Amino acid sequence: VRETFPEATIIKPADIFGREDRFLNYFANIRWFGGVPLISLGKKTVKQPVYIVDVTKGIINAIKDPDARGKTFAFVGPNRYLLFDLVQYVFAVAHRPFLPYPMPHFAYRWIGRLFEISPFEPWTTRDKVERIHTTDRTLPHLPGLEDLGVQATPLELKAIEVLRRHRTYRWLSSEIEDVQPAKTV
Amino acid sequence: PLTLEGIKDRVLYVLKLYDKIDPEKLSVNSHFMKDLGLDSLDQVEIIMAMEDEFGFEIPDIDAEKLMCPQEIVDYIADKKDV
Amino acid sequence: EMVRKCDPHIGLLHRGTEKLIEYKTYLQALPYFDRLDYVSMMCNEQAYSLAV
Amino acid sequence: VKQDMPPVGGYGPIDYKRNLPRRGLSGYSMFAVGIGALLFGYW
Amino acid sequence: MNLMITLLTNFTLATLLVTIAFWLPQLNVYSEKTSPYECGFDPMGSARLPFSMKFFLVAITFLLFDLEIALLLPLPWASQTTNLNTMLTMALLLIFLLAVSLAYEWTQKGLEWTE
Amino acid sequence: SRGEYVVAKLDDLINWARRSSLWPMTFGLACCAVEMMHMAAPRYDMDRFGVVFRASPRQSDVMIVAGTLTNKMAPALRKVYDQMPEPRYVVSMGSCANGGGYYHYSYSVVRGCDRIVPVDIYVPGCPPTAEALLYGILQLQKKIKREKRLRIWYRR
Amino acid sequence: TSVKPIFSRDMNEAKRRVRELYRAWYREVPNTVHLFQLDISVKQGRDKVREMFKKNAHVTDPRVVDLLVIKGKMELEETINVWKQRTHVMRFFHETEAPRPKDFLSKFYVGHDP
Amino acid sequence: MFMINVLTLIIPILLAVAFLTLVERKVLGYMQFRKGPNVVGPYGLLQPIADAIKLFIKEPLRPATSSISMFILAPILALTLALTMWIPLPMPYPLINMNLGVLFMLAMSSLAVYSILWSGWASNSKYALIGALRAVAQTISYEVTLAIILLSVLLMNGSFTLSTLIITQEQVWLIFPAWPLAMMWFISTLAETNRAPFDLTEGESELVSGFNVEYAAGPFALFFMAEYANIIMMNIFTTTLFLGAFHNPYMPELYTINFTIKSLLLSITFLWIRASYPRFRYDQLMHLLWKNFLPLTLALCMWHVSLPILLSSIPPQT
Amino acid sequence: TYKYVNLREPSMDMKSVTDRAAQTLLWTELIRGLGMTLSYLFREPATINYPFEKGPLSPRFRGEHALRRYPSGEERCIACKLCEAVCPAQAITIEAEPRADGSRRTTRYDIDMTKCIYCGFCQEACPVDAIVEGPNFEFSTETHEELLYNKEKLLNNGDKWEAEIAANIQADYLYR
Numbered sequence A: 001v002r003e004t005f006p007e008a009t010i011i012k013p014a015d016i017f018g019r020e021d022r023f024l025n026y027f028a029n030i031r032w033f034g035g036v037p038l039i040s041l042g043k044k045t046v047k048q049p050v051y052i053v054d055v056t057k058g059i060i061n062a063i064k065d066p067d068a069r070g071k072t073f074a075f076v077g078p079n080r081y082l083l084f085d086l087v088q089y090v091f092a093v094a095h096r097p098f099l100p101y102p103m104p105h106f107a108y109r110w111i112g113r114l115f116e117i118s119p120f121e122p123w124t125t126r127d128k129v130e131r132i133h134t135t136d137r138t139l140p141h142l143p144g145l146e147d148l149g150v151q152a153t154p155l156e157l158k159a160i161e162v163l164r165r166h167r168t169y170r171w172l173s174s175e176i177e178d179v180q181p182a183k184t185v
Numbered sequence B: 001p002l003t004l005e006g007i008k009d010r011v012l013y014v015l016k017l018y019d020k021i022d023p024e025k026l027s028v029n030s031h032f033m034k035d036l037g038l039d040s041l042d043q044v045e046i047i048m049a050m051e052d053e054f055g056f057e058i059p060d061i062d063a064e065k066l067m068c069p070q071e072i073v074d075y076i077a078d079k080k081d082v
Numbered sequence C: 001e002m003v004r005k006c007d008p009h010i011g012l013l014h015r016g017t018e019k020l021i022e023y024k025t026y027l028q029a030l031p032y033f034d035r036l037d038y039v040s041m042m043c044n045e046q047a048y049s050l051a052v
Numbered sequence D: 001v002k003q004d005m006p007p008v009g010g011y012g013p014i015d016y017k018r019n020l021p022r023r024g025l026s027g028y029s030m031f032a033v034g035i036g037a038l039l040f041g042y043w
Numbered sequence E: 001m002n003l004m005i006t007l008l009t010n011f012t013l014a015t016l017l018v019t020i021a022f023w024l025p026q027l028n029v030y031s032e033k034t035s036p037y038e039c040g041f042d043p044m045g046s047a048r049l050p051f052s053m054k055f056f057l058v059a060i061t062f063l064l065f066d067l068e069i070a071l072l073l074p075l076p077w078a079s080q081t082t083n084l085n086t087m088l089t090m091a092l093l094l095i096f097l098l099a100v101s102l103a104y105e106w107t108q109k110g111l112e113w114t115e
Numbered sequence F: 001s002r003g004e005y006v007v008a009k010l011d012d013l014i015n016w017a018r019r020s021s022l023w024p025m026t027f028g029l030a031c032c033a034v035e036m037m038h039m040a041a042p043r044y045d046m047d048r049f050g051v052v053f054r055a056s057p058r059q060s061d062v063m064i065v066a067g068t069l070t071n072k073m074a075p076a077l078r079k080v081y082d083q084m085p086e087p088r089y090v091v092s093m094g095s096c097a098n099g100g101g102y103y104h105y106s107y108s109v110v111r112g113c114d115r116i117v118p119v120d121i122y123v124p125g126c127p128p129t130a131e132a133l134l135y136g137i138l139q140l141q142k143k144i145k146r147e148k149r150l151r152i153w154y155r156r
Numbered sequence G: 001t002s003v004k005p006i007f008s009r010d011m012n013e014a015k016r017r018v019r020e021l022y023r024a025w026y027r028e029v030p031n032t033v034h035l036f037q038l039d040i041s042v043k044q045g046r047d048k049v050r051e052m053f054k055k056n057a058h059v060t061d062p063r064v065v066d067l068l069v070i071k072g073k074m075e076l077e078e079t080i081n082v083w084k085q086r087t088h089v090m091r092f093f094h095e096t097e098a099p100r101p102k103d104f105l106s107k108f109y110v111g112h113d114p
Numbered sequence H: 001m002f003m004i005n006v007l008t009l010i011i012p013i014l015l016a017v018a019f020l021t022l023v024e025r026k027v028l029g030y031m032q033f034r035k036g037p038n039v040v041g042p043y044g045l046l047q048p049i050a051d052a053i054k055l056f057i058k059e060p061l062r063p064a065t066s067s068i069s070m071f072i073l074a075p076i077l078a079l080t081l082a083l084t085m086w087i088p089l090p091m092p093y094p095l096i097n098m099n100l101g102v103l104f105m106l107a108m109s110s111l112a113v114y115s116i117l118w119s120g121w122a123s124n125s126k127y128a129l130i131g132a133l134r135a136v137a138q139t140i141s142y143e144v145t146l147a148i149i150l151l152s153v154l155l156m157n158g159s160f161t162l163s164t165l166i167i168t169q170e171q172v173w174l175i176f177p178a179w180p181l182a183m184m185w186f187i188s189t190l191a192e193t194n195r196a197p198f199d200l201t202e203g204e205s206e207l208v209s210g211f212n213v214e215y216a217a218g219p220f221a222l223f224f225m226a227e228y229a230n231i232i233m234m235n236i237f238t239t240t241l242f243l244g245a246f247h248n249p250y251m252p253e254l255y256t257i258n259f260t261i262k263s264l265l266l267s268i269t270f271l272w273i274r275a276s277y278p279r280f281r282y283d284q285l286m287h288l289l290w291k292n293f294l295p296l297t298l299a300l301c302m303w304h305v306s307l308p309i310l311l312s313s314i315p316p317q318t
Numbered sequence I: 001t002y003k004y005v006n007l008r009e010p011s012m013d014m015k016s017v018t019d020r021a022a023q024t025l026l027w028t029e030l031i032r033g034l035g036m037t038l039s040y041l042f043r044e045p046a047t048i049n050y051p052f053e054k055g056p057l058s059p060r061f062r063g064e065h066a067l068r069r070y071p072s073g074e075e076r077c078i079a080c081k082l083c084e085a086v087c088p089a090q091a092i093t094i095e096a097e098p099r100a101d102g103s104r105r106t107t108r109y110d111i112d113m114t115k116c117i118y119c120g121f122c123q124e125a126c127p128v129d130a131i132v133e134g135p136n137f138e139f140s141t142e143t144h145e146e147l148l149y150n151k152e153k154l155l156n157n158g159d160k161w162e163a164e165i166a167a168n169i170q171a172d173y174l175y176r
């Protein structure tokens, strides 16, 4: 696309989360399978997710501004997270029993082929595994949300908005401040 | 609730939990409006924070006559035994 | 299931008939009366006709 | 002229009254039928 | 044996008309379609509040009249005995005690409802 | 192909089962509730088509917005529509539900129910006749008949 | 200029009723955030109640702030009882509007509005 | 071949229920000066297939506040107790020939309340809980005569076997010695089975749907064809109790046709009482089965206890 | 000139008291209701076979709008804007200019059918019978802007339905 349309604005979102995402709802749909298995305890990968209202404001402020011709933006969240305490923060906002266990690097793709045998929308695959366990690179030489006049919204304001659906009734209306914030890196 | 030392320390602690009061100029004889630089609404939520922690309700006539932490600890000393 | 207090909140169908009447002529103000008591249409037509 | 008018002799009279025609048996006859049903069943 | 096979088959295709009903359509669930129903607007409070029973003396006395048909029930068998007048007397005595109980609940404002 | 033929027959089957048993919900608002009742009357009779009322949103296929959508009952209509299971349809009945109608310029009318809910059939009138409302339901059936659910499912 | 009062004789009772109304809102806001299960915190709601009280903080007429206490108590009466909904509470929080440009050059750019 | 014996029972009383929905809609249509469904198939004979296929592909909608274990356990138990109450009914020979089949029917009539009851509790709503405790208020009303009328009608049968009851009524219908018990049992069965004038838990006017206002399709089909299975089973039960037909042991098909058409006429009687009557306030349900039906039920119980001793007509227990 | 509903003191002889006791115990009025319902069971119901049959109407009926024409091809709308001055919904937008032969004709005749109240002040205020509210009621849509009729769609309705609208006005113009 860069070599066939030279003024194309190419935008890099890291890991978008919303009400209809495949990132936080994905992390809240492994109370069905077992105890949310992770590669190498999920401690060797670092993420920074960005909220979809900020990415949409960035795309529209890229449409409006003629300073976006040929650029290459990089939309990232303001706070970086490890994967393990991210999943533990999701299961603490969702107020679920969290018991993690490491599934190894060679046998978790064999569970990844167990779900991609479906003609439906498959539940998970080894590609989603290789993307969750791919850490978010930091690109300082590329512009972001602050180079479009967009203030990035952090995760602790909108994870409750995403994850109020996945709660049981016994903690259905627990407040936003009734959870511990995760550990940024 | 027993002695004025612990009551005064609890007043100053509830005051320094409030993120607009500077703990540097906050004394027992510092003034809220013209010296700490607070609105009336700031003073009224200070009074309601004291009603939460101390656990008794102060009416409106004697929640405006509290213009320094000395007056707060004195009025709590009037509404208690000590 | 015994009834202690009934409080009917109304105005879920409030459309502002008698403000739209002030900005239209009399012949234009008639078809609001079809739509007030919409099972007593020509009655309200007759009442507004007797008023005018 | 040629206008919508009623006919010259008027219309027929229109009934507008209650007509609940009082059908059914008496009370004693219904209890007689019921007690006869019980006695035949018991025999 | 065969009764348990019949009951298990009934439970089987009473839950296999359920498991073919959940996984069959496309579940598109978002956080309003599973909200509680209070005829359009939002519900006031929870539904697990104390929901007061006005028909409570009738609901107690239903138990004491349902023990009666743990007592009155062997009468199609007690009619087969050779101590007949005592059976007749005790049967009419139990239905009479039920009737005295029902009339005492009648007259002393029991079968009416409170409030 | 052969699997394409199977999913085409299954599309015909399930779209037939969804169009020949439309369940509207008892949702009147204004004068069009009278004509919606007359579409349920003995003369025009929705239920000969397999079309019967169910008052709960959990057990209804279509919501006929019969009447005026004011500014005080926008969230009630939206939550009533959102509590309907998929597939759900909306037949916008009458002029106030279509585009505000006779109270379009007024302060307390949502100018068309398409602002609040997605609308599949627009039935124009003030009120549209119960025969024309029945024609709107039949055009909804002609919209459900040409759904292509499992064809697009197999071709994705 | 000799008119009939509503509740207050002068600004002392008027500030008393404004102050008691704000006391009521500060007591109430956690219940509002809880039962409407809003995605906001208690701090942002109390900031909004502060903004709504400082929006009208220039009145010197006792009857006008008497009616403002009356309208604030009607808002309180419809907030404590669940007569408002999630939308009616969140209409104070202008989340869906485009942010209105305040300076002169952007207002010059986007339209004819002074 | 007992498995095929069960599957020739329970699937046709999943088809009789399905086309009973068509009979209900069309009889309720012509009794209300309209037509029923006749566009779907030839004169409606493919309507219940459409209503069946439509619901099971509609989104199941587990509620976010509901107790999901009880919420799924309740319609399974509803359709289970709809199916398992056909087995002691003599058709003319029952599938399971119990010595005490009538108490089996009565105890499963007591148990089938809990599906409605747990469905109204577990579906965490206000209307559902109103419909659950009104089912409590309905069952404490009909169970205080559904046992004594059933007791007094089995003082002329001989035992609690439903196969004995055909031998009992060989001379005359048992409606002739017990028409007050028949006309009181019939209303006990209308209050038992949530048909109008005793809907009250499917009450579309006071509530929206009562207990199943939260049950979306999929599980709502298993209250649809549970409740109508209850009404066909209860018409056949009152048919065997009061209208037992001529049984020839060499030709069971004559009796099967005869009680089929009698139970069809009583099912049309259900759909025809639903087609004409207003609905009780749910205390007048309770002020009927306690203030009007229960004293006369005790009186007729005394009469049917003391009457075979008065006439030497004590039935055999064999 | 007035009557008392429900002021019937009942008879209290043993005959009528026994009759009402049998009416209570043996359910007489319930059998009366069952008899009336069974008597409407055995009729021909009034369900008409739509869409192969249609509902009865009259030539005054007010449905989908149309612009008519003279019997020489020239359109009737001489752009005089009474129909937007009387339209209670203000659903009609008219702009005009002198065309090539100098005749006063429209260039914009919009009728917003989702504003229109179908009351026919336009077809009775038009001094040349240009705008008429035709007999078409089966003109439902699937998209909202399809019900925003401009001049072209109204001329197409007029040319499409003129064989019916001209006969209805021919049958009705003596009552107006």
Ligand SMILES: CCCCCCCCCCCCCCCCCC(=O)OC[C@H](COP(=O)([O-])OCC[N+](C)(C)C)OC(=O)CCCCCCCCCCCCCCCCC
Residues within 6 Å of the ligand: D031, D035, H175, H180, H182, H183, H184, H186, H187, H197, H238, H242, H273, H288, H292, H293, H296, I024, I025, I026, I027, I030, I031
């Ligand atoms: C099983 C085969 C079919 C059975 C019959 C099927 C057809 C009949 C059903 C018709 C439709 C009913 C639909 C639901 C109706 C609900 C209302 C209802 O039932 O109300 C009950 C009504 C209630 O009456 P009520 O509520 O109007 O009572 C008046 C009360 N006050 C004054 C306070 C207002 O009637 C009964 O309860 C009657 C009970 C049964 C009567 C049996 C009488 C036996 C007589 C024996 C002889 C007596 C003579 C003296 C002694 C002689 C001794 C030898």
Ligand SMILES: CCCCCCCCCCCCCCCCCC(=O)OC[C@H](COP(=O)(O)OCCN)OC(=O)CCCCCCCCCCCCCCCCC
Residues within 6 Å of the ligand: H041, H042, H045, H046
């Ligand atoms: C105990 C007794 C219980 C009885 C229960 C059932 C009662 C009703 C029985 C069915 C009554 C008739 C139903 C007819 C359905 C329509 C059949 C048909 O011809 O459909 C035409 C359609 C399109 O075909 P096309 O090639 O376009 O031809 C049109 C010509 N221009 O082609 C199609 O739609 C495809 C073919 C569909 C065939 C469907 C047949 C009916 C299925 C009903 C289920 C029950 C089966 C029978 C059970 C009893 C007998 C064993």
Ligand SMILES: C=C(C)[C@H]1Cc2c(ccc3c2O[C@@H]2COc4cc(OC)c(OC)cc4[C@@H]2C3=O)O1
Residues within 6 Å of the ligand: C039, F026, F027, F028, F029, F030, F033, F034, F036, F037, F040, F053, F067
């Ligand atoms: C069930 C059938 C066959 C009929 C009856 C009926 C409907 C559809 C909708 C409704 C309805 O009746 C109820 C009660 O009566 C009115 C009367 C109304 O106005 C007189 C009114 O106006 C909004 C609304 C309503 C309800 C309403 O929404 O179809």
Ligand code: SF4
Residues within 6 Å of the ligand: C035, C038, F030, F031, F032, F033, F066, F067, F068, F093, F094, F095, F096, F097, F101, F102, F125, F126, F127, F128
């Ligand atoms: S579109 Fe008009 S006639 Fe119809 S309900 Fe609305 S106000 Fe009444």
Ligand code: SF4
Residues within 6 Å of the ligand: I083, I086, I087, I088, I089, I090, I091, I092, I111, I115, I116, I117, I118, I119, I120, I121, I122, I123, I133
């Ligand atoms: S019928 Fe429609 S277009 Fe004509 S005047 Fe009335 S509202 Fe306006």
Ligand code: SF4
Residues within 6 Å of the ligand: I076, I077, I078, I079, I080, I081, I082, I083, I084, I094, I125, I126, I127, I128, I129, I130, I131
């Ligand atoms: S339609 Fe008739 S009234 Fe309207 S501008 Fe044209 S000629 Fe005049």
